[PDB]
């Protein structure tokens, strides 16, 4: 499970993210769309050009949700219930894609922290993002 050390490493990195929710979120999404083009089919209603209004606003929403996850890390399922129903029942998101976005978010973190994105910080975020992903897909099981 996530240790107290994991949580502290996560929070330290997170307060930086919260300062630029739009930028971070949009970058994670754009890397996913460019590197894994198949994911773009979930957003036909979006103008997917670089820094589009829809990408930036959604990027902020994604980061906001992850932020809420950080706060209620011991109560993930309950906190993301509405979102888990949305992604499973409404959007029918393939579980594989949660891993792709999680990976892209880690790339954004790595690019922004450089030297500071240590193996320990990576482990912490891998655990965190994997936990969030499991919850967003739990309505499939």
């Amino acid at each position: 499970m996530l240790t107290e050390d994991d949580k502290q490493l996560i929070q330290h990195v997170w307060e930086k993210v919260l300062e630029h929710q739009e930028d971070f979120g949009a970058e994670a999404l754009e890397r996913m769309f460019i590197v894994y083009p198949s994911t773009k089919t979930y957003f036909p209603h979006f103008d997917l050009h670089h820094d589009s209004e829809q990408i930036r606003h959604h990027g902020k929403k994604v980061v906001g949700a992850l932020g809420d996850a950080v706060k209620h890390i011991d109560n993930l399922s309950a906190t993301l219930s509405e979102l888990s129903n949305l992604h499973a029942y409404n959007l029918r998101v393939d579980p594989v894609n949660f891993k792709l976005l999680s990976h892209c978010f880690q790339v954004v973190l790595g690019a922004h922290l450089g030297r500071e994105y240590t193996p320990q910080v990576q482990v912490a975020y891998d655990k965190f993002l994997a936990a969030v992903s499991a919850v967003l897909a739990e309505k499939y099981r």
Partner: protein, 146 residues
């Protein structure tokens, strides 16, 4: 695969600046730390009992250097990857019996490491080319199973 001039350039230009020893040690250490079951294949490497122990393990670092040097052989001959890794495919599949899923995990780790080392140059477009690269190497190594 099918390499465009732009993709080949993203790969060769970045690789020329890569500290293979540093990046390789980082990639292997992270594999063992982030996906601990992989430690099963490195019993002869000594102490791997903690993240700090793994990061200070000389053999892990040396092995990581050799692994990234191998990735370099893909970079140097982008159109003949399947052929370049046929030998290593037999080793990992027939001899070591490493499940191919782990080849993809290591590739993902390398992408993250490259991002921590080249923030300005590792654009989404650069990431796309490099991801195509690590996936091609993983695919080539997995052929010893298919």
């Amino acid at each position: 695969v099918h390499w465009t001039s732009e993709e080949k350039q993203y790969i060769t230009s970045l690789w020329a600046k890569v500290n293979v020893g540093e990046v390789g040690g980082e990639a292997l250490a992270r594999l063992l730390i982030v996906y601990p079951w992989t430690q099963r294949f490195f019993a002869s490497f000594g102490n791997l009992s903690s993240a700090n122990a793994i990061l200070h393990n000389a053999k892990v670092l040396a092995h990581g250097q050799k692994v990234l040097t191998s990735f370099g052989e893909a970079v140097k001959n982008l159109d003949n990857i399947k052929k370049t890794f046929a030998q290593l495919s037999e080793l990992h599949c027939e001899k070591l019996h490493v499940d191919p899923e782990n080849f993809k995990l290591l590739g993902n780790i390398l992408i993250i490491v490259l991002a921590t080392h080249f923030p300005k140059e590792f654009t989404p477009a650069s990431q796309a080319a490099w991801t195509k690269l690590v996936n091609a190497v993983a695919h080539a190594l997995a052929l010893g199973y298919h």
